[PDB]
């Protein structure tokens, strides 16, 4: 269904960096993960505990949906990281570059 | 400004890759590249000439916004893709490994 612009637009998509990955205790699959947007930190609760070892996403550049309402998921979240999943494998977005932490994708 | 999920929900991000990056004659700045989502073929206007090379675009694995409202640059465009900019670089978005062309983005 087609979507207008500024239904876009109203999306912060951003670029951040994965600070902190610690396991979410209330939840079997979700990691509590921190993300440095540059200007500011948000811990948001991402199940990939099923894909990736906190080793594998520490220090990573990953897409998040910055302002999303905030969420009481157990714990407190805010927004989620973007990744794509072909119903098999499943693959965080991030930039084909470095940049700025807080880079507003659009 | 807090954005709801269902808000997110009715954007369709899709995993595609870029086929070809032709120069679009009747703007300076814009390519016309043509991105295949495996089911279909997604042909849009990107301003990327600035930043990227044909060489560099071709078989390149790219977030696009699917579902976006078709529109008339020109040249007839559907959807765009998603990349950061810290007001310097530009960089693309892409998955951190392969997938289906069409994967979903959540």
């Known amino acids: 269904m087609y979507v207008k612009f500024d239904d876009f637009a109203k999306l912060d998509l951003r670029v951040g960096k994965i600070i902190e990955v610690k396991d979410h205790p209330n939840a079997d699959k979700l990691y509590v993960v921190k993300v440095d947007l540059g200007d500011e930190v948000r811990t948001l609760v991402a199940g990939l505990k099923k894909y990736y ?10 897409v998040v949906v ?3 309402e905030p969420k009481k998921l157990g714990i407190g979240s805010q927004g989620m990281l973007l990744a794509a999943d ?7 977005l991030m930039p084909d570059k470095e940049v700025k932490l807080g880079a507003k994708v659009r």
Chains 1, 2 share one sequence.
């Open 53 to 62: 070892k906190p080793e594998e996403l520490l220090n990573r550049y990953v």
């Open 66 to 68: 910055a302002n999303l």
């Open 86 to 92: 072909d119903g098999e494998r499943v693959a965080l």
